[PDB]
Amino acid sequence: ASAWPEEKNYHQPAILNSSALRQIAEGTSISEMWQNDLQPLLIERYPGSPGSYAARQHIMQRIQRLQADWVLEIDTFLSQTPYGYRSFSNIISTLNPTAKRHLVLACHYDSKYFSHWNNRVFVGATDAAVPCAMMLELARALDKKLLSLKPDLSLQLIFFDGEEAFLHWSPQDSLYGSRHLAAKMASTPHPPGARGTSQLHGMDLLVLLDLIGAPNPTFPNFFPNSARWFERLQAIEHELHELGLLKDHSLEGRYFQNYSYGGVIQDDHIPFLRRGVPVLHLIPSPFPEVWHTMDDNEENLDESTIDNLNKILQVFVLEYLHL
Ligand SMILES: [Zn+2]
């Protein structure tokens, strides 16, 4: 009986030295992400809408142009909703599908439904167009390194559909894509041919990005079983800061602070967390002031903060993967 699903418990990062940290800082471009990955997603894209289709095509196209061997899968399903049966489509992008273990980065790509109000349209810039663009920029920036994966451990990106409630949050109206995918992964043997392990056993850690892009975010350390990875984000932030590789940033105003949060925040990690998957939930507390208002738009995003977080996340991912 292999103990491979226990490997994630002892897995340690391969820490980058100063020269490598400078290379990563210089290799990501916030203005390219902004133009090429983010702006095309700043559209109405509630489930089933034309915008949902356009967002999905954009995400797939941006991944398909990369050199690394990404395998794209669209996970389409039906669910009951306050408006009757509807269809949803999760996007899964995976390097080394048969690899036993994957580090998983995720966000939701749907935008919350709102009828137009005084000619304003809700585009959910921090929620979660920026997180989607950060995942696309990371895939682009680390492409040469990821190409080398073509430790049975690799990378997977999930863009969930239907994270938002069609009305206000309730247990049955929200998290459509993640409740569906967690149950599908829990009942899918992995690796192929396995007798008793599932794709969830293969998920080393689910790093879920949401509500990112406003000024002064503070991310709490939510869960004890991922606390040592939260500490790694703190260390990376601190070292990039000390190397002068972050912009408009101070340690008193750092993003990863020493403080927990005992309450529950409803998000796409919930169906995974309740099936035993370790989660690092990169959502700030408090939420951006523009949360669920028409002001969650491009104008209210903080460019240098998003840039700093791209650098921290990319370093975290290379260190976890030993790349
Ligand atoms: Zn939201």
Curated annotation (Swiss-Prot):
Changing H281L: Reduces activity by 87%. It holds the Pfam family Peptidase_M28. Keywords: Acyltransferase, Disulfide bond, Glycoprotein, Metal-binding, Secreted, Signal, Transferase, Zinc. Changing D210A: Reduces activity by 99%. Glycans are attached at N17, N258. It is an enzyme of class 2 (transferase). InterPro entries: M28_QC (IPR037457), Peptidase_M28 (IPR007484), QC/QCL (IPR040234). GO terms for molecular function: glutaminyl-peptide cyclotransferase activity; zinc ion binding. The keyword Secreted applies. Transmembrane segments: none annotated. Belongs to the glutaminyl-peptide cyclotransferase family. Responsible for the biosynthesis of pyroglutamyl peptides. Has a bias against acidic and tryptophan residues adjacent to the N-terminal glutaminyl residue and a lack of importance of chain length after the second residue. Also catalyzes N-terminal pyroglutamate formation. May be involved in the N-terminal pyroglutamate formation of several amyloid-related plaque-forming peptides. This is Glutaminyl-peptide cyclotransferase. It comes from Homo sapiens (Human). The lineage of its organism: Eukaryota, Metazoa, Chordata, Craniata, Vertebrata.
